[PDB]
Amino acid sequence: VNITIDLGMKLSGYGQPIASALSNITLPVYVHSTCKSSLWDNVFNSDCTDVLHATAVIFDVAARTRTNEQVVRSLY
Amino acid sequence: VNITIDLGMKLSGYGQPIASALSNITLPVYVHSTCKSSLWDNVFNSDCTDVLHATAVIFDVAARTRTNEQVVRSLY
Amino acid sequence: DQSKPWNVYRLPKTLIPDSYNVTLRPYLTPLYVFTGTNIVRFTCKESTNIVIIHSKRLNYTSHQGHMVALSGVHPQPVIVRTELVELTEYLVVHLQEPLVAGRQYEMNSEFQGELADDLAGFYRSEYMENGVKKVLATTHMQATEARKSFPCFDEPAMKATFNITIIHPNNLVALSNMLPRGPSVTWKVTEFETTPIMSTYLLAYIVSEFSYVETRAPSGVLIRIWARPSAINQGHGDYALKVTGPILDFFSQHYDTPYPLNKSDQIALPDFNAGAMENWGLVTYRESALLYDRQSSSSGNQERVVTVIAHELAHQWFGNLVTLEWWNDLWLNEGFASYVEYLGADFAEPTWNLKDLMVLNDVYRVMAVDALASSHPLSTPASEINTPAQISEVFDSISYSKGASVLRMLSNFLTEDLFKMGIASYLHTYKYGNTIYLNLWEHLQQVVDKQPTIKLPDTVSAIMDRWILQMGFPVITVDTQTGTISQQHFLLDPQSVVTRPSQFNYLWIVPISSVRSGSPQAHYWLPGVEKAQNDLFKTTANDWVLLNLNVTGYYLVNYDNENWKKIQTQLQTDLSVIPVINRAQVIHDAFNLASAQKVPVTLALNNTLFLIQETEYMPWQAALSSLSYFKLMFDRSEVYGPMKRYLKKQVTPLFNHFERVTKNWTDHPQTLMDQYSEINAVSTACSYGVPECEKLAATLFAQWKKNPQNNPIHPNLRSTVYCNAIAQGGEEEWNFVWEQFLKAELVNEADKLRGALACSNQVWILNRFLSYTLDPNLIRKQDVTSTLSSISSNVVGQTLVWDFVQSNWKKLFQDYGTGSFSFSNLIQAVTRRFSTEFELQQLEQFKKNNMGSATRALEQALEKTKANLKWVKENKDVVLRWFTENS
Amino acid sequence: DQSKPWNVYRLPKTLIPDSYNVTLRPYLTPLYVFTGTNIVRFTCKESTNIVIIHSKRLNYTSHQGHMVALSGVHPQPVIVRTELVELTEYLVVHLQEPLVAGRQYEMNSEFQGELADDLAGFYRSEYMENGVKKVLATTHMQATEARKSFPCFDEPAMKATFNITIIHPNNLVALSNMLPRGPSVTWKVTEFETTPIMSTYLLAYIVSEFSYVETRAPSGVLIRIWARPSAINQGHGDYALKVTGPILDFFSQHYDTPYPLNKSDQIALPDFNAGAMENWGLVTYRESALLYDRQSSSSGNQERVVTVIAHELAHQWFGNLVTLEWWNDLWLNEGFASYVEYLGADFAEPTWNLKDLMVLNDVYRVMAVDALASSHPLSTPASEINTPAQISEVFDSISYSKGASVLRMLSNFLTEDLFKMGIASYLHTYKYGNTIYLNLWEHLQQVVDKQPTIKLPDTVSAIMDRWILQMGFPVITVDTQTGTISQQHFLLDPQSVVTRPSQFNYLWIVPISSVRSGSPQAHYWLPGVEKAQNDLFKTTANDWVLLNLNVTGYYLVNYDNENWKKIQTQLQTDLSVIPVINRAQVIHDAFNLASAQKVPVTLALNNTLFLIQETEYMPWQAALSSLSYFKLMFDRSEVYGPMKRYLKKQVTPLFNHFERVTKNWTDHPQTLMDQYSEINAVSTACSYGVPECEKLAATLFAQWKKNPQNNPIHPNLRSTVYCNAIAQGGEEEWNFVWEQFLKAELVNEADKLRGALACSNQVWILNRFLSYTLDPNLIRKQDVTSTLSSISSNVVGQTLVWDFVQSNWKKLFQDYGTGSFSFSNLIQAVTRRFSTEFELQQLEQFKKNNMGSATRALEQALEKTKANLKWVKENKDVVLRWFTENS
Ligand SMILES: *[C@@H]1O[C@H](CO)[C@@H](O[C@@H]2O[C@H](CO)[C@@H](O)[C@H](O)[C@H]2NC(C)=O)[C@H](O)[C@H]1NC(C)=O
Ligand SMILES: *[C@@H]1O[C@H](CO)[C@@H](O[C@@H]2O[C@H](CO)[C@@H](O)[C@H](O)[C@H]2NC(C)=O)[C@H](O)[C@H]1NC(C)=O
Ligand SMILES: *[C@@H]1O[C@H](CO)[C@@H](O[C@@H]2O[C@H](CO)[C@@H](O)[C@H](O)[C@H]2NC(C)=O)[C@H](O)[C@H]1NC(C)=O
Ligand SMILES: *[C@@H]1O[C@H](CO)[C@@H](O[C@@H]2O[C@H](CO)[C@@H](O)[C@H](O)[C@H]2NC(C)=O)[C@H](O)[C@H]1NC(C)=O
Ligand SMILES: [Zn+2]
Ligand SMILES: [Zn+2]
């Protein structure tokens, strides 16, 4: 149904977008992706910028960035 | 007629192909381009490599490289 | 004149106190001073016509013509005279008639002292809060400083109850050992409940304006953490409160004795040079070691917090409930705490594997100073400590670290259960009393004799005599061709002469475990003879042995070359067979034996070849600690070329490993050991020119500089990133870091920035930094020497710092050589690269042109320079050949 | 005892030689020696009974009992005795009867000398060809060294014809001043034609195995270039042969006299420390200054070749055709050549604008040493030069550079046509004779008096007396508010005391040109008075003046502040109005006046603000030469921060300009000035951290390292690229450059690589280089000091080099202080950064602990250090403020 994925994105030490494993999935078949950025303290209180922008895709739920796709969680 | 252009190519101090103004044109309308490379001493005794490869194009006769075209001479 | 009893440093055994009534009234308004009144109730065990009581810098008020008044509890004594003896810090009262034995007497007095800025007795601490300056009144009365606050029998064996009363302004709050008796009613009076039977040096009371966070354990103990209101509001005291409870529960179960008191207050002070004091019921810390900030603190700070809390809470049973009879047994107290803190911490942090760090923190730290001919035994007769300076002399690193090591060894060869049973019996038998180490040995022997499982070659006291009565530790040499085993007194200097006699002729009774190709063997005892033979140490061409498992014994181990080669082959084949502690042990022992010219240095270098596949922290830490001397001796010569290369070759995989583990440095490990390993990997990779580490540091520094408000760099990596970015960059990075340092409010971040500022490769920048160090507005005085040492660590800054010190000798000596040991440490730190004859001649010329303690420091530097010159001349060619062949 | 004529250093005026017959037979087979026979024909002007003739280290053979034989051309003299006076280098023959006046006599002798390794007289030179060692026999008989080869009247005023004969192996060839008389017939005899009337010090003959390239001018002169056969085959002598002809034609037209001889041979020697010698018909050069390689030589080498050829070919008329009467007028000869070489070179290279470089090469080079109280005048009486050491003392930089400057000024204010006419008359009148400068002054005065156009304030000799009889030069101060003009003796030290008296009281008669806002004015003469007034120097609020046009006068110029501001505004508005030589002059004069505390240093710094839009070479060169002292004094302090920034801001456009002109560094300029400007731009941009220059250097070094066989880097940029790549990189670049240096066959490339090896920023690499300098197999002895100086130029290597020199003082003094001035230059080069009291105290302590010329060098270094300390303490704050405000 209306499945929502809250992705968490971080900027790596080399300056690359990395999809955090702390992303959340809600199952209360449209998919709604909400992106949140954070720092080393793992506090997702900032909206994602252009660089750290990913779309939730789908089994394994992954985050498609502008250059790659990274597996976040598994909906088993 | 059978116009031949002997282009002279050099590698710049930044590592870029530069078309030397010492290129030669012969008029004894097919165009035949022959590429020769050299060093700071201006001795075109080496065949052009892949990087320093240019094709003579056409008025002004120029040298089209893989990334740009540089005017070599003028056939006025 | 020892005939007069008031000329003897030891208090007479004629009068025994029972209870005290102390009333104090600090005057925080300035010439800061305090006034008070005191009542002492004592019993005369033997008839005497004189009363002697400790007193130090107290002005008394005349009472019927005399300083103090005396009465019975009635043949009232007549005070013929009363005087002060400043040499022995005494107050002598002469009575016209001898006191009747078996009768109790009360002495009243009224006195006025000073609240000075020296951390002794009842003093004052001035700090800066916001833009204002605030003053608090606190006590540090350890050892022989309770006499400075009120007249008392200031000896640990003199135990009495105390009734404390404080008079303080309404705007302040007062803390003591016990709970207040009720509400405090421009001045208020606070009274506290009667303390149990305790010693004078364990008392404390503090008047200040502080906030607290409180909790209650299921056992009913009220735990409070006190700090400045800002720190409490920011939540900097939450971790200490969280970990205090589990540690108290662990110590209650381990000692098999409930917590003796009802409350547990721990207070953090902005300025406390002592570090921590184990006052009964009111523990005092420095705020840099008790408060934890989850936004700017690294893992080392958290480990320090938990370990210091465990160490100070261990004293509540062992040290306060049962106290030492005299200051010559202090090693037994402190060392015990220094051993059990890890255990307590291991209970609070089960996943940190803290008990493995103790070796690196203690054993290897003390073996450096215990392997010298200038060492001293743990135990000395009580008659050799009478002067307060002699009393203060026993608080040294030997008493802590080596005491912890020997107690750990004793606990290991007696098993934990028997050790705990003996400790519990000892605590139960002598509660609210004083003891000597012989009583503990007797209790342990009683526990041992009641079980048939464990058998010892001799009694507990006989075994411990070898380890507490003579200095040093043995080296045990094993020949596996025949299985012969021998022991010898180990010294770092092969040409050293020991002039301190020993009653055992430097022979120990040694407990020895071992494995055979990873399979445990039977426990063995070296019986105190020079040589012996056994088949536990005889091997064929296939198997090998390794003795000191987990380094539970306080000795070094040496093998024959074939056994070393087999061990190296096993390390190159499968690391997991050999425990990680022993993997660090082989490196440490090989380097120490090479320094003593017992094995070639090439063997020590061969022992480091397995680090290319090692991901643990302790072997890397041991190897880097050993190779620091090589780096100091060879960083300005041709040997530095290959050596760096070799280290790079060794460190490239480890870094790569973490680069894969951390997901390009986004997620960081949660365990302490893995975090230490990651810090080591990043630091070593950036120090020896790995391009990925430099790129990481540059990118992180750029991210930080883009948004200085929020630091994107994890606190574990900040120092390495800052130093590497400054080293790679130029004036812009240095200026940015300097501007950040100037506006820094915290202490850890400011220290990290100041340390990073010394990594510059430009001569003019370093000279400008040296010029900055002369201004107190930019660099604080208490940091100046540290800064210099950091600038001395740079290979470019060695000559600059030496010239700066030579040019400013008088000012530096005046500012840091009056009563502090920081000047000697600065002199030692700036001369440790000297290994050439030209440098030796220059140092000798400087000494000749500069003729107190400065000359002694120069002489020690000259001796160290001569030793370094000899070592370099002896080892340069072979180490260069090895590094070229193995890089 | 001056009564005896053989104790007088000056030869008697009694005997005059007419012709010589010299026969020589070198023995290249080794104890190398040579033998010969000699015949001297002379006339006795006055009757005498003694014969004195120069002779130095010649073993004679007995002829009838005496060393030499004498006969008439017959009252045969009887030789009573013959002896050698070693002090005056004489051979004295005593005759029983006085010689008859008006009669000619012949003296025969047979002698045997040594072919030593010292470059004096007839000596030997040993060089390495391929893998073998070869020996040649050559002569350097300048000054007073022809007596060392054969007995002669060795004075320049003694002129005679010569007949030379050589006996040499068949495998060798022999060269002399004249053409051989015919074919040379295991030994061969070569005879040469009779020389014209010439002096003894101009003779030369060389026996060697050399090849030559020949050509014939349209005038009929055969021009030959001689060198080693390998160099001739490779074509390294083509440029010299090409340029020799045009220079000879120019000198034939300029002197208005044809070439006196028939052939012109120029020979390059592998080892010739003298540089070049102007032997008549056979000029000798060092191969590093005569041979040009079109594959590895830069533009500086080509300019040096053409200028040295012109300088040596100028002597064929002025110096050889007409010679000095005595060694006290040498400044007239050398200086003249030092002025005309550029002119000759300007004819050979019309597009190089060489005549503008002379200032930078000569005037500004000599004003540094002529502005000291220790200077000396150009002209001295002949009676003050008698000792050969005194004769050698006159060959100093003053005689060359200041002589060239004064002769250039004289030529400019007399116009070129009149100067050439006077020179031609002087050459025609005194051909094959000797002169003094008064004769040249008289000829110039005669030419001046024969024309009405040019008018002088006095005679030529009266004007030149002010410039040749007193030391120093004036500074001319102009006040434009009133038009007043004054002159003063200029000294660099404001607190210097001049103790050398002057007959003119240090007042000159000064020729002054000027422009008014770019418009020429009328020529003016300062008449030898301290102060004067004229309306040529009075300006309104709009116009400005500038005096020394093209710096044709040997003096400094100072203005009032308003005129300086107007000049600076004009420079910021339009550069083209002011000539480029004067654009360099303003900077040079401002800095020199600031050093003398006549103008504030801020004015000198303001004068450099126009360089941000300057694309010429001379102003940049002058500014960098002036700022080298600032860089030396401030490269280890806080002033180095802003200063570099400012220089970067000034150099960024110029670099960009050439980046656009050269088409990303592919096509390089063809004119000498543009090439110098490009070299300056690249060097300055890379030295002060311009990222584009660093990227260019890294890319070029990578291209070179990819294919070491062919060097893709243009020879003009090789030094900068190598040094910058080594500075940016690490051990790999340094090792590559070191390996290239070890296998280098040429000299210029090896020198460039060795200089680049000293740009490393690593302490251990620099220490390893210092260790390498101790091995003669790696670094040659003759380069060692130079290498040290280069390592001293690095700010990191200053302390390392100073410590190395202090540690190896004795060996360095033994190897380079025995008879060479290289040790003094090394001492001066390694101590020029000393500006602090600590460094001064250390230097004084070293001097006290090290007590010949070494102590004098240390004392001079102490004085320089004191001056530097005072200057830094006086200027640091203001220069820091200026650099911060203008960066
Ligand atoms: C300190 O205060 C305590 C009570 O807090 C006093 O102990 C009491 O003393 C009185 C008077 O001697 C006895 O009657 C009580 O039995 C004591 N209470 C007990 C034992 O619980 C103590 O004496 C005071 N100390 C002094 C006065 O020196
Ligand atoms: C350190 O290891 C090296 C390399 O294995 C050892 O040198 C070898 O020694 C064996 C004999 O045990 C020789 O057969 C090899 O040829 C040696 N290899 C070399 C020199 O490259 C060296 O002995 C070890 N050092 C010790 C044990 O001190
Ligand atoms: C040097 O050789 C020259 C010839 O090359 C000699 O000059 C000739 O000398 C003879 C003998 O006196 C005269 O008869 C000739 O007239 C001279 N030739 C001329 C003037 O052209 C010269 O005498 C020789 N020098 C000596 C012998 O000292
Ligand atoms: C160098 O140039 C500066 C900048 O122009 C001069 O300082 C100025 O002086 C004028 C007066 O002539 C003042 O009106 C300006 O305010 C000054 N500007 C500043 C200080 O920024 C300076 O005098 C010059 N130095 C000299 C001539 O020695
Ligand atoms: Zn403790
Ligand atoms: Zn000359």
Author numbering:
A (entry chain B), B (entry chain D): 536 to 563, 581 to 610, 644 to 661
C (entry chain A), D (entry chain C): 64 to 93, 98 to 140, 144 to 255, 262 to 927, 932 to 967
Q: What's the paper's own text on this?
A:
FCoV-23 is a recently emerged, highly pathogenic recombinant coronavirus responsible for a widespread outbreak of feline infectious peritonitis. All coronaviruses are decorated with several copies of a homotrimeric spike (S) glycoprotein that is the target of neutralizing antibodies, drives viral entry through receptor binding and membrane fusion and contributes to pathogenesis. FCoV-23 S-long comprises an amino-terminal S1 subunit, folding as five domains designated 0 and A–D, and a C-terminal S2 subunit. Collectively, these findings identify APN as a bona fide entry receptor for FCoV-23, which seems to have broad receptor species tropism, mirroring that of CCoV-HuPn-2018.
We show that FCoV-23 can use several aminopeptidase N orthologues as receptors and reveal the molecular determinants of receptor species tropism, including a glycan that modulates human receptor engagement. We detected binding of dimeric Felis catus APN (FcAPN) and Canis lupus familiaris (CfAPN) ectodomain dimers fused to a human crystallizable fragment (Fc) fragment, but not human or Gallus gallus APN-Fc (GgAPN-Fc), to the immobilized FCoV-23 RBD, as was the case for CCoV-HuPn-2018. The apparent binding avidities (Kd,app) of FcAPN and CfAPN were 11 and 1.3 nM, respectively. To understand how FCoV-23 recognizes APN, we determined a cryo-EM structure of the complex between the FCoV-23 RBD and FcAPN at 2.5 Å resolution. By contrast, the Q551FCoV-23 side chain is hydrogen-bonded to the N740APN side chain and interacts with the proximal N-acetyl-glucosamine and core fucose. In receptor-binding loop 2, W592FCoV-23 is packed against H790APN and P791APN, and its imino group is hydrogen-bonded to the main-chain carbonyl of N787APN. We note that the substitution of R540CCoV-HuPn-2018 with L546FCoV-23 abrogates a salt bridge formed with CfAPN(E786) (corresponding to FcAPN(Q779)). Transient transfection of a membrane-anchored human APN(N739) oligosaccharide knock-in mutant (R741T substitution) rendered cells permissive to FCoV-23 S VSV entry, which confirmed the importance of this glycan-mediated interaction for receptor engagement. Conversely, removal of this oligosaccharide from FcAPN (T742R substitution) reduced FCoV-23 S-mediated and CCoV-HuPn-2018 S-mediated entry into cells by two orders of magnitude, which further demonstrated its key role for binding.
